[PDB]
């Protein structure tokens, strides 16, 4: 198309008048190059804020991707055009769009050292844990490119993300956790005392958070400072369903904490009968005795939970 190429060339050169005249004469605002480049791509690439706004007003696709997968936001970040980045976000640009190599706008900003653009992409929900085709994150690219201010900025964002996923698990919000998962969250990340989101989820009974994390790759046998597998914390609080899911995904029945207790101990200590039945079905060792020399039968009789001691002897 004749008018199309002229519009592309006008947006790149920064000729607002020609841009307006060509569109006034029927030039498609979303004209496509042979590589998929649109005039918005070239205006955002060149740093022409006025043209960018003009094109968007006339219906420019804010999320157009060329053959390599770059969007106007990729290009604005690639060249460090803060004002354009903001305008593209105001107009509904996908902050977490990925090009062919897995790079997102945050990757590019972190790679080229555009601190102010990093800050803005975060404020608008940029995925901090995204990994490109080469398994590198924006923080990895800041480190490899010697952008230390951005490195510290992104490291603190990962930490803040780590605490939110702990609260959202301790609170019980699936979709609120799921948005953090899609934001690049490390489900296997723990706090200072080795407590993961799967721990706090299995302990408080905010179910279904348990299933997603295990399907995401959360280590079922993650042990905290006290050697507690999430299966331990679920046995005490008395949440049946969670017990099956963990054992359903390779959890260990004979997992021993620092004290030497297994989920069968903690279920016989508390007084949750229906728990021990499930454990016994999975070869839960009734002979296992902790460092106190006590067996799950000893704790069943110490706390006087007779119904438990009875069934423990039938299976012993």
CATH number for the domain including 295? 1.25.40.20
Q: How far is residue 278 CA from its own chain's centroid?
A: 32
Please say whether the dihedral angle defined by the alpha carbons of residues 182, 223, 221 and 245, taken in this order, is positive or negative: negative
Ordered DSSP codes for 32-75 = --TTS--HHHHHHHHT-HHHHHHHHHTT--TT---TT---HHHH
User: 272 CB contacts (<8 Å, ≥6 apart)?
Assistant: 235, 238, 240
DSSP code, position 36? S
Is residue 225 in a domain?
yes
Do 12 and 42 touch, CB atoms closer than 8 A?
yes
Structural domain of 227: 187-316
Asked if residue 205 belongs to a domain, the reply is yes
Domain count across the chain = 1
Token digits of residue 279: 């454990």
- Tokens (6 digits) for 168: 């959202």
Residue 240 lies in a domain: yes
End-to-end CA distance of the chain: 84
**Determination approach:** X-ray
- Whether residue 70 is contained in a domain is answered as no
CA gap 37, 63 in Å, rounded: 12
10 Å CB burial of residue 123 (0-12, 13-18, 19+) is exposed
Q: Give whole-number Cα distances, 236 to 233, 263, 265, in Å.
A: 6, 8, 9
Task: Give dist(CA 215, CA 228) in Å, integer.
Answer: 21
Tokens 């060329």 belong to which residue?
66
Q: How is residue 145 annotated by DSSP?
A: T
Kindly state whether residue 16 falls inside one of the protein's structural domains: no
Domain membership of residue 195 (yes or no) is yes
305 inside domain: yes
Query: How many Cβ atoms are within 10 Å of 170's Cβ, its own excluded?
Result: 17
Residue 149 lies in a domain: no
Q: Tell me how far the alpha carbon of residue 242 is from its chain's centroid.
A: 22
Q: Taking Cα atoms as reference points, which of 36, 38, 87 lies closest to residue 61?
A: 38
């Amino acid at each position: 198309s004749d008018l199309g190429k002229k519009l592309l060339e006008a947006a790149r050169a920064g000729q607002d008048d020609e841009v307006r005249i060509l569109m006034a004469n029927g030039a498609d605002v979303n004209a496509a190059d042979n590589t998929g480049t649109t005039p918005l791509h070239l205006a955002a690439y060149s740093g022409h804020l006025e043209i960018v706004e003009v094109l968007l007003k006339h219906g420019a696709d804010v999320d157009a991707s060329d053959v390599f997968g770059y969007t106007p936001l990729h290009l604005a970040a690639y060249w460090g055009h803060l004002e354009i980045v903001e305008v593209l976000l105001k107009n509904g640009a996908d902050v977490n769009a990925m090009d062919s190599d897995g790079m997102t706008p945050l990757h590019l900003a972190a790679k080229w050292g555009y601190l102010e653009i990093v800050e803005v992409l975060l404020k608008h929900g940029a995925a901090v844990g995204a990994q490109d085709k080469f398994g590198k994150t924006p923080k990895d690219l800041a480190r490899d490119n010697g952008n230390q201010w951005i490195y510290e900025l992104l490291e603190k964002a990962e930490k803040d993300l780590r605490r939110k996923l702990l609260e959202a698990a301790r609170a019980g919000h699936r979709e609120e956790v799921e948005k953090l998962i899609k934001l690049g969250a490390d489900v296997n990340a723990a706090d200072d005392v080795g407590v993961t989101p799967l721990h706090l989820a299995a302990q408080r009974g905010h179910l279904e958070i348990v299933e997603v994390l295990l399907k995401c790759g959360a280590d079922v046998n993650a042990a905290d400072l006290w050697g507690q597998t999430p299966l331990h914390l679920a046995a005490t609080a008395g949440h049946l369903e969670i017990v099956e899911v963990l054992l359903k995904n390779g959890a260990d029945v004979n997992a021993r904490d620092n004290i030497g207790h297994t989920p069968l101990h903690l279920a016989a200590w508390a007084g949750h009968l229906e728990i021990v039945e499930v454990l016994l079905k999975h070869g839960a060792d009734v002979n296992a005795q902790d460092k106190f020399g006590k067996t799950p039968f000893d704790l069943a009789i110490d706390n006087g939970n007779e119904d438990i001691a009875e069934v423990l002897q039938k299976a012993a």
